[PDB]
Amino acid sequence: MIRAVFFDSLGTLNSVEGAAKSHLKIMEEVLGDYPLNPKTLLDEYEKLTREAFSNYAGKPYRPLRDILEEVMRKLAEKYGFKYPENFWEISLRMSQRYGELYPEVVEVLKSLKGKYHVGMITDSDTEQAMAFLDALGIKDLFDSITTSEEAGFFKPHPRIFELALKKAGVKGEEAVYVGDNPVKDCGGSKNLGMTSILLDRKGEKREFWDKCDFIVSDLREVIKIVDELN
Ligand SMILES: [Mg+2]
Numbered sequence: 001m002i003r004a005v006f007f008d009s010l011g012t013l014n015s016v017e018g019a020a021k022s023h024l025k026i027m028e029e030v031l032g033d034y035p036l037n038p039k040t041l042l043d044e045y046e047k048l049t050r051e052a053f054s055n056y057a058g059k060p061y062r063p064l065r066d067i068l069e070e071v072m073r074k075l076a077e078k079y080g081f082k083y084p085e086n087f088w089e090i091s092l093r094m095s096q097r098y099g100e101l102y103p104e105v106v107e108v109l110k111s112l113k114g115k116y117h118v119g120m121i122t123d124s125d126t127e128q129a130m131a132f133l134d135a136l137g138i139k140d141l142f143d144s145i146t147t148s149e150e151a152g153f154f155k156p157h158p159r160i161f162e163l164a165l166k167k168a169g170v171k172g173e174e175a176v177y178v179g180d181n182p183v184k185d186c187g188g189s190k191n192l193g194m195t196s197i198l199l200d201r202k203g204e205k206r207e208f209w210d211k212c213d214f215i216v217s218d219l220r221e222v223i224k225i226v227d228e229l230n
Helices: 016-030 038-056 064-079 087-098 105-115 126-136 159-168 182-190 205-211 221-229
Strands: 004-007 117-122 144-147 175-179 195-199 214-216
Touching (some): 064 087, 087 126, 105 221, 126 144, 175 182, 175 221, 182 195
16 A cells, blocks of 8 residues: 655745746846846756756766856856856755745645655755755655665666665555656656656646656645545
């Protein structure tokens, strides 16, 4: 039976309308006064990271700090603004301020907790992951936090799911994984036997609904699915 429920972080629990805001303010901070539109830097930044996250998918871990910094240095040299050494520090500050949870998050974690092992599986560095959960105040709502730094590999590599299943002591078939990336989340968890639930609040990922077992648009639908399976 289902004795565990695992969630992704970005795009699943934190409001993308909140991450987007934070990132804009990060770039505004880095610039300010400099004759470059902050929104233009943001879009170029997102393009570069997207490519970096694409190139490391399912491969050996490498500090996200070094990756994201190679990108900013690239952009600073390209546009001529001062590379902020405290880029990593400024990033966190803006997250803790403008980053927020989707409305039903606490509600859902509470229900699943107690009766089912509740864990997190993220590609983020371990320290970044802790500070983040601590900022949104949901650290103690999890029984386990599993990261790529700990597994040595990024999603969808199987090792990051295996490790989370071990920390829990359950078998893949006895576990569920909730995420918003059809291939990285659902495709990855699937290789371990886990039951996959794709979150798609905007109803856009219709094109990739088949790669997943279930499709929800509100995390409250997960408690339903679980019991239905038990
Ligand atoms: Mg995601």
